[PDB]
Amino acid sequence: SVLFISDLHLEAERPDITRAFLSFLDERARRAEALYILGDFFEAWIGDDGMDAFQRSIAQSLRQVADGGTRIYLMHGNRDFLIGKAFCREAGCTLLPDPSVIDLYGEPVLLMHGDSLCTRDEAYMRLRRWLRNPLTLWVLRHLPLATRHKLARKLRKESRAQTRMKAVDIIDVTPEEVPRVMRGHGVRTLIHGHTHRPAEHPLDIDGQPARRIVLGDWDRQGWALEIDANGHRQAPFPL
Template sequence: MTGAGRTFFVADLHLTDERPAATGRFFRFLQDDVAGADALYILGDLFEAWIGDDHDERVAHDTARQLKSLADAGTPVYFMHGNRDFMLASRYAAQSGMTLLADPARLDLYGTPTLLMHGDTLCADDIAYQAFRRRVRHPLTRALLRHLPRSWRHRLARQARAGSTSAKAGKPAEIMDVKAEEVVRVLREQQVCRLIHGHTHRPARHLHAVDGRDCERWVVPDWYARWGYVVCDAAGCALTVENSD
């Protein structure tokens, strides 16, 4: 099977050496489905954690080779930062053959203006997370982190993951989902009627009424107990969700 005439979108793979099955699944997906496609867009959280472009997990090196092979064969690969891998920078992108995208990114997708986001900024009711996001994404913070010893950055990443798990346990589920009013605001501001994002791990197609028009929002699945993607062509988009092997 080839992906010719189609564009694929994935997010929230959370690849790590501790989850080799997900890594193998992703590599098979690249070879069996994406090869020959018009493009692959990775909408954040490709990795479980990213401490910098000197990240030393084996999965980082193996993933770079797989993505570079895909790009060299003619399928462009685009990467947007997530909340787990916002430290990924130009060195690793070049090694992987990826083009870095801003969040949000607007593109013409087979004639339909489409907005791409990781999705975390749409969770506007999670005030504590949004404040944390602003702090860690500040250029000075990122510059400081990059200059810390690698062992310190590994320790900070473990602490951040533990803190995130603890914080989620104490929050109502609706706070960690997108805010409908924020979705409408972004669609109106960007003048698009299609949005594709990840982050929430709640794959679905939603409709939002924006100034009298029905606009669609596609949520890309995570790759934990399941895996999947959104694929678009000239006729529209579709969501695929599969159970893990």
């Protein structure tokens, strides 16, 4: 089987999430063929050269699972898009671009963090385009660590303020973007996180059934999607 998780927002100040995550590695990820982490694994990332002791310990825990035979894949999210290849080597994982299509038991499956589908959130779209500009990425990776933390705090603070003012249908995925991107990639299954609204959404693409599976965030309970050759299940578990 293969496991999918996202939106853990791991940080030292949430040991309830960390404990649940490590228990998840011990009870489930170790016996899976692969684990996919679809963004927002960490609460924030300021660049691989700014990794702190907590983040390093998380990497070591991932690496123990990878070294035991489970393949681990990590995709960027809006919190942790600065993760680079050094971190991935340390954690024993492979960096996957957003979007990626994988072969899952003979079916092509599209993986995204999900924020790129939230096209009605125009202020966020402007921010995202800027953050992912190669010039921005270069600058951010070459600022003093103290300065990076200050910018990260500012971004979090302004984001929390603005998001409290946005209706659900500003921040959730744009409905018509879903068939657009799924058709474009030739898939009938899409898995993403970001929106904190765990669910499975049927839809019709060109007359055929399709599904969009949304991974749950770990703020109040853990979530995992498990897929094997014969079916799938997403379910929560306590922190």
